[PDB]
Amino acid sequence: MYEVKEFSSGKRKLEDYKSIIGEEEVSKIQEKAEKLKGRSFVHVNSTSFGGGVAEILHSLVPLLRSIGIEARWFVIEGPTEFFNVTKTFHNALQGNESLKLTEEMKELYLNVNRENSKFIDLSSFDYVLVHDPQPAALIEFYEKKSPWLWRCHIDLSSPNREFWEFLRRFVEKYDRYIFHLPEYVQPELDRNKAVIMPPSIDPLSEKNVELKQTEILRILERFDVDPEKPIITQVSRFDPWKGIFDVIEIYRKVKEKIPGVQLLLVGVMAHDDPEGWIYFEKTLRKIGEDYDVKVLTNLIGVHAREVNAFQRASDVILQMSIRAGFGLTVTEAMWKGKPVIGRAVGGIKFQIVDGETGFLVRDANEAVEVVLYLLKHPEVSKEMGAKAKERVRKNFIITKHMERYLDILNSL
Numbered sequence: 001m002y003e004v005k006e007f008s009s010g011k012r013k014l015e016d017y018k019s020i021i022g023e024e025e026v027s028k029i030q031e032k033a034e035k036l037k038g039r040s041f042v043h044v045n046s047t048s049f050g051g052g053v054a055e056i057l058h059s060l061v062p063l064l065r066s067i068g069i070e071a072r073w074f075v076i077e078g079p080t081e082f083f084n085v086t087k088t089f090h091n092a093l094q095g096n097e098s099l100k101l102t103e104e105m106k107e108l109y110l111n112v113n114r115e116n117s118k119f120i121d122l123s124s125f126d127y128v129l130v131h132d133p134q135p136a137a138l139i140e141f142y143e144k145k146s147p148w149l150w151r152c153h154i155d156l157s158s159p160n161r162e163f164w165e166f167l168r169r170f171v172e173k174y175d176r177y178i179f180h181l182p183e184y185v186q187p188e189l190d191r192n193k194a195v196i197m198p199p200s201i202d203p204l205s206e207k208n209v210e211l212k213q214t215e216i217l218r219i220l221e222r223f224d225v226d227p228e229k230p231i232i233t234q235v236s237r238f239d240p241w242k243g244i245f246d247v248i249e250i251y252r253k254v255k256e257k258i259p260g261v262q263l264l265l266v267g268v269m270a271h272d273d274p275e276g277w278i279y280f281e282k283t284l285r286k287i288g289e290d291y292d293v294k295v296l297t298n299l300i301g302v303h304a305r306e307v308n309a310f311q312r313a314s315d316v317i318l319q320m321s322i323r324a325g326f327g328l329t330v331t332e333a334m335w336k337g338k339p340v341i342g343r344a345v346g347g348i349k350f351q352i353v354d355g356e357t358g359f360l361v362r363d364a365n366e367a368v369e370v371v372l373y374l375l376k377h378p379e380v381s382k383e384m385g386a387k388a389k390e391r392v393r394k395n396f397i398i399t400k401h402m403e404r405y406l407d408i409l410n411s412l
């Protein structure tokens with residue numbers, strides 16, 4: 001079990017966001033952090049590199065620090081054989097009731113947890129937060145003296161029975177269980193001690209920070225995107241249920257009335273995700289040689305900062321997921337003032353205020369209508385975008401994220 005000490009976002013402090021949330025909110029914040037002044041608020045997880053959870057803590061910990069709380073972040077150490085099992089635990093918990101949990105695995109898991117628990121006495125802190133499965137087992141290797149919080153970053157409405165009955169012996173312990181949406185909350189738990197906390201976006205990160213016109217254009221000219229013609233875009237992982245083929249249908253139907261429209265299929269995916277790289281190949285084959293369609297991924301060098309450019313350069317953003325988690329991509333788009341068109345699923349139904357900040361469609365032909373509407377009526381589009389930005393500012397920003405936690409500690 002290592003520790004953060006440093007960070008990457010730098011010395012992020014509530015002040016760096018003053019301009020974004022106004023002083024009344026920075027105040028309202030500091031207030032809620034006085035009643036928790038000089039306290040212990042530790043975070044534990046699998047890694048500080050790959051992941052959004054990691055990307056969130058790098059900004060969140062410093063932030064908690066600079067507000068009066070002695071935040072601190074410890075990570076977990078383990079051999080490949082430990083992560084692979086957890087990779088399984090993961091997909092097991094998110095459905096896929098074909099994986100088998102065995103004693104070899106249980107022993108390994110619990111042991112890794114028993115060991116990494118002999119490095120830092122977690123029970124000594126005023127409050128403890130454990131992120132995701134991997135370290136859930138820690139809670140039974142110390143005697144509770146303070147509240148323990150379990151933060152879940154995955155779905156738990158239909159988990160692999162075998163695996164949930166095991167993990168649950170750890171989760172049921174913690175004082176509160178935190179889920180992104182009110183659908184990931186397993187019944188085996190006590191709804192009274194459960195907390196809904198949508199994730200958030202950090203306005204100042206690579207993925208969401210305001211770039212300069214010139215850089216956007218460089219990134220555009222680099223992947224052959226014409227900023228002078230209309231652009232529609234869907235940012236998402238390449239899997240069978242993100243509506244990627246529907247977006248292609250939409251782009252084609254729209255293209256009949258607007259022959260210059262361009263479709264941007266953006267998406268970063270790990271090199272060990274065959275499932276993903278196979279749907280990716282399938283997509284290119286379906287698109288055929290229509291180069292007005294740009295398939296942008298990390299293979300070709302697309303990353304957070306490039307994705308940033310692509311979203312900003314878009315006229316309309318789509319998210320035709322058929323099955324979705326919270327949908328941070330919809331959030332980023334809303335932050336950049338873009339009207340989103342998407343399906344009523346998971347987090348997408350909660351973020352989009354139909355008719356106000358974007359539209360919720362049921363199929364592709366309806367998605368086609370609104371895309372043409374918006375394209376034809378830019379001022380309207382600009383409107384929905386502004387509102388969408390406000391919605392995020394007031395609801396899904398890393399500061400409203402923290403303030404949510406602060407609310408959780410004063411409620412213990």
Ligand SMILES: O=c1ccn([C@@H]2O[C@H](COP(=O)(O)OP(=O)(O)O[C@H]3O[C@H](CO)[C@@H](O)[C@H](O)[C@H]3O)[C@@H](O)[C@H]2O)c(=O)[nH]1
Pocket residue numbers: 052153154155207235236237238266267268269304307324325326327328329330332
């Ligand atoms: O191709 C991609 C895909 C994701 N992102 C980033 O990831 C975020 C969007 O994530 P979404 O695409 O919102 O993530 P989900 O698909 O909703 O993640 C689901 O699946 C995960 C496991 O794979 C679970 O842990 C989550 O709880 C579950 O919601 C955005 O902020 C992006 O910065 C990219 O930049 N490019």
